[PDB]
Ligand binder design. Sequence first.
Ligand SMILES: CC(C)CCC[C@@H](C)[C@H]1CC[C@H]2[C@@H]3CC=C4C[C@@H](O)CC[C@]4(C)[C@H]3CC[C@]12C
Ligand SMILES: CC(C)CCC[C@@H](C)[C@H]1CC[C@H]2[C@@H]3CC=C4C[C@@H](O)CC[C@]4(C)[C@H]3CC[C@]12C
Lengths: 388, 390, 157, 380
Amino acid sequence: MRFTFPLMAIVLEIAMIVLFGLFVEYFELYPLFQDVHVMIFVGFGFLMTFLKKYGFSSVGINLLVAALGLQWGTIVQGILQSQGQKFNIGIKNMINADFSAATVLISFGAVLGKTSPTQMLIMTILEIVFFAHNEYLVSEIFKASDIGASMTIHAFGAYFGLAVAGILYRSGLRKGHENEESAYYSDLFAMIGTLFLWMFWPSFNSAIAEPGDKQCRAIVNTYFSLAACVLTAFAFSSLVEHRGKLNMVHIQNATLAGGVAVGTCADMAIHPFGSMIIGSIAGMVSVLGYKFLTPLFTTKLRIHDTCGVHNLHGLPGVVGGLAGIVAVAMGASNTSMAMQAAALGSSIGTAVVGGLMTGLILKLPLWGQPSDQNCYDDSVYWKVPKTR
Amino acid sequence: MRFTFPLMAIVLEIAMIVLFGLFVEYIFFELYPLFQDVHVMIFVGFGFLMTFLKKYGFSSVGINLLVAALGLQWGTIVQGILQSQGQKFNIGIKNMINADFSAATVLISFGAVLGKTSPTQMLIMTILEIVFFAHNEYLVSEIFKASDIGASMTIHAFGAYFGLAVAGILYRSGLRKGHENEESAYYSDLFAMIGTLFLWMFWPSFNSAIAEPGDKQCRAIVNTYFSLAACVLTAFAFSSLVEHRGKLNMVHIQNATLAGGVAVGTCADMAIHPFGSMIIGSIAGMVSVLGYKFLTPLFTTKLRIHDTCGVHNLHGLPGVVGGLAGIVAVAMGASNTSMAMQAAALGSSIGTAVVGGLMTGLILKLPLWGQPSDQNCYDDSVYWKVPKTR
Amino acid sequence: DAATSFLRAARSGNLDKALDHLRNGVDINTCNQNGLNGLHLASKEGHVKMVVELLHKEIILETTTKKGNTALHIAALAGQDEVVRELVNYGANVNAQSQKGFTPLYMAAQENHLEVVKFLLENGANQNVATEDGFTPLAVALQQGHENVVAHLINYG
Amino acid sequence: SSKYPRSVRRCLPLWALTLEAALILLFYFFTHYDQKGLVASYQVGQDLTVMAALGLGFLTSNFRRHSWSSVAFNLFMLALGVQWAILLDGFLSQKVVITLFSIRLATMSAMSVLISAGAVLGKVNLAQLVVMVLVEVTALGTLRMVISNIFNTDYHMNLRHFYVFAAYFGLTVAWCLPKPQRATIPSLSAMLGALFLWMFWPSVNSPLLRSPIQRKNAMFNTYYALAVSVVTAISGSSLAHPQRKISMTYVHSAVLAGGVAVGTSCHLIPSPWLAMVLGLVAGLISIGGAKCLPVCISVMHSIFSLLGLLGEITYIVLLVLHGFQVLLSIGELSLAIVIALTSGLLTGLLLNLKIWKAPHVAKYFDDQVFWKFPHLAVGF
Ligand SMILES: CC(C)CCC[C@@H](C)[C@H]1CC[C@H]2[C@@H]3CC=C4C[C@@H](O)CC[C@]4(C)[C@H]3CC[C@]12C
Ligand SMILES: CC(C)CCC[C@@H](C)[C@H]1CC[C@H]2[C@@H]3CC=C4C[C@@H](O)CC[C@]4(C)[C@H]3CC[C@]12C
């Protein structure tokens, strides 16, 4: 039915309005919020525009998903922090809502080109519920340090998306698809999202950091982790390719793995050289994941990941959690070992279970899912111009 | 003729330098990030939003840059003279923000006549429209004492109806049934999405830059944020509703998603609640999409007013909705100031925009500015060296 | 080691050393680990004097590497137009296909070697032979933005 | 020789990984870490980062088939240059204490290399760019140290010469390279980069200023000079073009005219009208440079060199109002030019070495030399 999507959008927006009326009441962190905002809407959205015939859907469904996500995440996170009471909205609430949007966009990267906008609204609602519950569990029950959210955002979003994409497996797409290919100007446009994410990631890892030493440490550690990650990602992209050519998939994504893998240890006293070690390992791991694990996941495990979010968010997020555990081992933080480990395990497990349930819901033929031949095509949901 | 554009620009720049020397002298760093966001909205958001035309991207972004760069200087001069009543004045961050606001008004008007004007015509439009806009907003803020912190009436409604008046005066009979160059392309639409996203992201700074620090500025930021969030949902829903087979339209996604930011402007700093801001955003998106589908086709064919970017559906109708929302908010008791003064601000904005746009368009209608022919409309090659390769 | 020295002389352009090695008894058809014999390396590095001398010494002209590339394939990919002219003058198959189905015309078109494309077209190269992937020299030239190659391919037809 | 590019599968990874490992080891052995305006101070360095990665990265993406390499190589160059500049500014100005101010200054040093690389982009591979980054950062640091030792100024405050140093270094390196175009979508992306550069250039003109009124006046002067320069450039492009049309490529370089012209004297100009006069004069000189310099390789870097020289000259003129200091400042400028030229020559002869596997002159300005593309024959 062509009216399912507008009906669900209108009903969800009316529900958001009612929930805000029921639960919501009314400046040094605003620039950091705007940096995170640019990361959410320009970074991910244009990062996903590499597909030659899916740019409209990439950027537009990014905008739609994140716009729904900030409202729903505001409501859910505020209800959790207020235990069902009314709560006020500051800059921190907006930052955390953008973080929930980031998690949903990371999961979107796994199912890009094979899902409808209606499926994306449903996934946004369910995933934000699961993410907010797991993040509350990590922050308040475990009380683990995840200021950059390698575990609660990146690993969670990646494995949630992987679980959804595994449930939504199509046999006709395992060997590939003719629309699943990049173009020259499409990769040029994807570089925009890559560069904005790279430039503004230090604010991503330091926005809600405790003011003082921790926030400055988060900024500096993220910056030098990304600086090392770029060099190592370039080097290993050349290393894994024939005749040492550079791969735009690697340069677009693996250059950002240092920001993911430094998130847990961002505000920790890991020193700039330790941050650069983490960034180099993240870039290497991301390139190796793109080159070797993504074909293994697509062909053997039947898990197709369109944007390779397992290589940018999943493996580097796990690496960040393990780095947090090791940093706790050597006195870089006063948080417990077992709580960091429990945060990692809970994030991964909750992501997998929530993704399974959400994908089982998304598998019902009620949401206008595209056919196998029509995957990675804007024309299923958009009016497309006649020329490029 | 051959030297009209450079000569007019050099004379205008020398006049700007002389006026600055005669009248301009030298909280700043707290408001500077918001000014930076507004600057990005002016030069990247508006500039790339209009690059959807397949053969007019160069002129879109470049004339946006030229118009806004001239506009910041001229708006600084005019607004400072009006505020100081003809005396020498010192410029601060507020002066830059207000000058960029004046440039934004001129760019909104430019969106109506995009592809049918010359750079000389846009120089003249910038010069005249900044005078008209600054006088109207001085009347609204100082004589009416109305509250329009997000400038739904003084910038958006004014700019849209000024551009509509100019487009009506500059009407071309040969363009009534469309033009082969008046259509988008894939990568042009992606560039337009760049502009759309930057406007959408930085609109809270747009609506809170001049707000009183403390509760009013924070309220403006939160209201704009959630109004835009609701506006995106309703714009997507109604774009799916009104199009054939439910397909989304990139025009709607590029423009109607900013209607919530346009419409919440008058009520931005008022205590309407976040939920009230969401209701205004949801209506703003609905009204913008319905305007793009039904109102623009009627205005172009029945009314002979061709509006290229649909700035009536983004700035015109949502600007009037925002002014009306502000009137309801004062009646609700959310705001100080009278109902009659908000209504007077709305009416004065519309009337001054229409009258000034008529006189400006009559000046622009003179065959002296090298305006393109009907065949050459929406084509960069009239004024730019266009590469052979796309 | 004599074969290795002969192949190094082929790669470096040292015609005198390689001719001395051939006089000493080095086989003419010896190839390296990648299957590139002396003609392949001489074509790669553009040593026309070596190509002529090897062809005079009864080297096999239509021998392939493990990738399936003849000396004309290598000369076309490397853009050595004078080596291409020499090979075709000595009877090189201009329509030879590699293991993936590339032709010398495809290799010249993908690398923006306009004069090589010109010569191959003038010598009867078929611009309709597609690869395994289904690509033509025209398609690969369009993808890479080799506009002069596209123009000459459509003008020759 | 073979126009097909030589395999860099062993050169580039080993070179980059060795560089990163050496940087990590040096950071371990020499770098050490350590309020109210933390975010305010972070904003300036963040603006410089946006102007380096996005502005200069996309400004040179106007090439028809070299946009990928322009953007990605600029990102790589920035990432390498900031780390190396941190270490070198630590070594030549004293353990290395890492603050946000030091990261900002390292970003400025990297931006010098990013400006220089526009003269050579499209004619070099990644390894040559690594060599250029290292040697140019070293040369700029050495120039600053020499100035600090001779004229007794602060090492960090000597970084004001970076416009003219970058321009002349890039010109020399490009002159030493072997001798040898646009598209609409890359031109629009380059307009994006140019707009970000033009919008944030008031941050380039006041990172090194401590006094708040000095930064205020510098940003005011840069903003008004840049506005006037944009108007002058866009209007006068038609005069300095054979077919009397506006050139996108000319605009991309000439918008920055006023910012470059007032860069060394923005904090000294007392009224906005003088900054606007300087912006207008810079725009007119940009028009004249476009009309004249091709007659007498990159024209935009040549006009940038002229503009930087003009900025130093107007600094000399304005400093007298606010004759021995004239001689001293002329000497500082000439020492900067001499060191830039000599170090650019050294870099150019280093880049000409066969070991770098530089692209063939027939293969310039082409992404297929460095990047993977589908449906291509690979190898032999
Ligand atoms: C999140 C990832 C990394 C780990 C957990 C993924 C698991 C739970 C998912 C992803 C791979 C999935 C399987 C992939 C392929 C098929 C074949 C299909 O015809 C029926 C479902 C079935 C059998 C899926 C069941 C669920 C599955 C096993
Ligand atoms: C990816 C998995 C295996 C985690 C291991 C990552 C390693 C390489 C990382 C993670 C934690 C890091 C350490 C965290 C804390 C310290 C103490 C500090 O004073 C110096 C750096 C040092 C010593 C870091 C060195 C590098 C380190 C050991």
